[PDB]
Amino acid sequence: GSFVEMVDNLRGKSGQGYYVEMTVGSPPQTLNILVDTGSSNFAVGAAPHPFLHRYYQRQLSSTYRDLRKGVYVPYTQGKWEGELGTDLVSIPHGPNVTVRANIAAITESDKFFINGSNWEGILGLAYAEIARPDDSLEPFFDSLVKQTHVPNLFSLQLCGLASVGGSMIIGGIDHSLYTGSLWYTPIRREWYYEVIIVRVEINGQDLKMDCKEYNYDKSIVDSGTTNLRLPKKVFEAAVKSIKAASSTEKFPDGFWLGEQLVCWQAGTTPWNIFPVISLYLMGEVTNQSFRITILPQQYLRPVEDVATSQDDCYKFAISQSSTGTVMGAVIMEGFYVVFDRARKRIGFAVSACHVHDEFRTAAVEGPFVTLDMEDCGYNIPQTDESRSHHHHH
Ligand SMILES: CC1(C)Cc2cc(Cl)ccc2C(N[C@@H](Cc2cscc2-c2cn[nH]c2)C(=O)O)=N1
Ligand SMILES: [Zn+2]
Ligand SMILES: [Zn+2]
Ligand SMILES: [Zn+2]
């Protein structure tokens, strides 16, 4: 209700996401939960694991109700699986309400929990369509809004191992967390937080692709993804351009693949040879867009290893995708991002936790007017499995 209580309620480690405290059950069990706008389950570690000291103990919650239904959730990189139920859930540093939500108690997992990350569970903030095992499992935020008078919106300020902070404001927008204008791009379809990129520039220069290539096969806003991820053709045009701009430096191929650090003497990194990247997002008005401009300090991420303490070393945090553009924590860290589910749009403003550069600034600017936007959306080939399923909503 007053966002002073919700400011600074996220923590994390670099490249391991941002988590918020939540309490589950009665009496309350406090757990650190990853904020993930890329998925739609609330799932908590619920059995011992080498990388957890803490986990949800269903047997200690007088309010736990078992749903007697399993759930299995494969990723390209690993998996989690568990038993569905419901429990009382509150956010200690969030709105002053308690709700009964679905919770998947993770009983087995592979490559999901990481050594040292400090979270024990994930909060999928995206829409029911992508929930597992299907869209009848109501996601947490849908329950929150239905059961309380919490407005149907939340906003994220992600402030860039190494430790990180920021804010998730639930039910509102806190004006102390951004400067300048807030620009909105429509949510194209409520499954992921899917948006439409209409133009891409690297140091002022247009990539000049068919704009559907930018959104092939979707573009999404995803706090659960580290990198900016780009479709193959786009990723290759982008690497070409950033290489061109930085050609005073001849890096190994591993670097461009994210597989190798590149270093300079401490304090000497030539930031000026690395270009800014502007993504122009479809505006709320037909024929308008606005751009979000990313500094090299967002996509070249420092990594401290043992054998080069007097060097600053960096990993390239743009990577190739085969499942569309993903605007991950790398993009989000520049910005205050408003998930306005009520008005089916996403807002971007320059964050009050700025990443600065010597001479340039991360920016949100518009309008830019065209001959449409454009149509730059891609229509994913409709499978027979998708076609057949009935959605009685
Ligand atoms: C949302 C989440 C946790 C989903 C996920 C499931 C699995 Cl099994 C592995 C990695 C990830 C994963 N990967 C991120 C990296 C990341 C951001 S927060 C925690 C992670 C992570 C990396 N490995 N396991 C979690 C990515 O690919 O960019 N993100
Ligand atoms: Zn607390
Ligand atoms: Zn039917
Ligand atoms: Zn359905």
The finding on whether 109 has its CB within 6 A of some atom of ligand 1 is no
Q: Return all residues near 2 (Cβ < 8 A) that are at least 6 apart.
A: none
Element holding 181 (H helix, E strand): strand 178-186
Residues marked as catalytic: 36, 222
Q: Which ligand is nearest to the CA of 390?
A: 3
Q: How far is the CA of 21 from the centre of ligand 2 (A)?
A: 6
Q: Which atom of ligand 1 is nearest to the CA of 117?
A: 19
Q: Which ligand 1 atom lies nearest to the CA of residue 34? A: 18
Helices (H), 211-344: 232-245, 253-256, 296-299, 329-332
Note the resolution in Å, 1 decimal.
1.8
Q: Ligand 1 pocket, 180 CB below 6 A?
A: no
* Beta-strand relationship, 29-36 and 194-195: unpaired
Q: Is the dihedral of CA 215, 209, 76, 346 positive or negative?
A: negative
The answer to whether 123 and 35 have CB atoms below 8 angstroms apart is yes
Name which of 226, 303, 330, 319 is nearest 17 in CA terms: 226
Domain positions in the chain are 18-150, 151-393
CA–CA dist 172, 376 (Å, integer): 30
Question: Separation of 129 CA from ligand 3 center, angstroms?
Answer: 16
Residue type (1 letter), 169: I
Cis peptide before 367 (omega within 30 of 0): yes
What pairs with residue 135 in β-bridges?
none
| Coil vs helix vs strand at 161 | coil
What kind of fold does domain 18-150 have according to CATH? Cathepsin D, subunit A; domain 1 (2.40.70)
Residue of 296, 38, 280, 13 whose CA lies nearest to 165: 13
Looking at residue 296, what DSSP letter applies? H
Residue 269 in tokens: 């990194």
Secondary structure of residue 77 in the 3-state scheme: coil
The Cα 189–Cα 59 span in angstroms is 39
Q: Is 62 in the pocket of ligand 1 (CB under 6 A)?
A: no
**Short-list 354, 267, 261, CA closest to 307:** 261
Cβ atoms < 10 Å from Cβ of 233: 15
Distance CA 354, CA 232 (A): 30
Cis link prior to 27 (omega < 30° from 0)? yes
Q: Whose CA is nearest to atom 5 of ligand 1?
A: 112
Q: Are 113 and 25 in contact (CB under 8 A)?
A: no
CA distance 261 to 276: 20
Largest CA distance in the chain: 64
CA 182/CA 60 separation, integer angstroms: 44
Two tokens, residue 314 = 């960096």
Instruction: Give the C-alpha separation, 7 to 350, whole Å.
Output: 16
- Residue 175: C-alpha distances to residues 8, 167, 180, 238, 343 (Å): 14, 12, 10, 34, 19
Fold annotation for 151-393: Cathepsin D, subunit A; domain 1 (2.40.70)
The DSSP element (H or E) to which 309 belongs, if any, is none
Q: Is 275 exposed, middle or buried (0-12, 13-18, 19+ CB in 10 A)?
A: buried
DSSP sequence for 329-365: HHHHTTEEEEEETTTTEEEEEEESS--B-SS-B-EEE
Looking at residue 342, its amino acid is: A
Distances (CA, A) of 330 to 15, 160, 218, 226, 327: 9, 8, 18, 6, 7
Is residue 258 within 6 Å of ligand 1 at its C-beta? no
* Closest residue CA from atom 26 of ligand 1: 225
| SS3 state of residue 323 | coil
CA dihedral 234→236→241→242, nearest 10 degrees, is 100
Pair type for strands 318-321 and 228-231 = parallel
DSSP code at position 383: P
| DSSP label at residue 249 | S
Of the candidates 187, 219, 166, 217, the one whose C-alpha atom is nearest the C-alpha of residue 327 is 219
Q: Which strand (E) or helix (H) includes residue 386?
A: helix 384-388
Q: Which of 195, 314, 212 is nearest to 260 (CA)?
A: 314
| Gyration radius (Cα) of the chain, Å | 21
The DSSP element (H or E) to which 119 belongs, if any, is none
Q: Does residue 194 contact residue 356 with C-beta atoms inside 8 Å? A: no
112 ligand 1 Cβ < 6 A? yes
d(CA 228, CA 284): 23
Length of the chain in terms of residues written: 393
Q: Whose CA is nearest to atom 20 of ligand 1?
A: 16
Residues paired with 43 in a beta bridge: 104, 122
3-state SS assignment for residue 62: coil
In the sheet with 311-316, reading across from the earlier edge strand, the strands are: 262-265, 311-316, 300-302
Contact status, residue 316 vs residue 249, Cβ threshold 8 Å: no
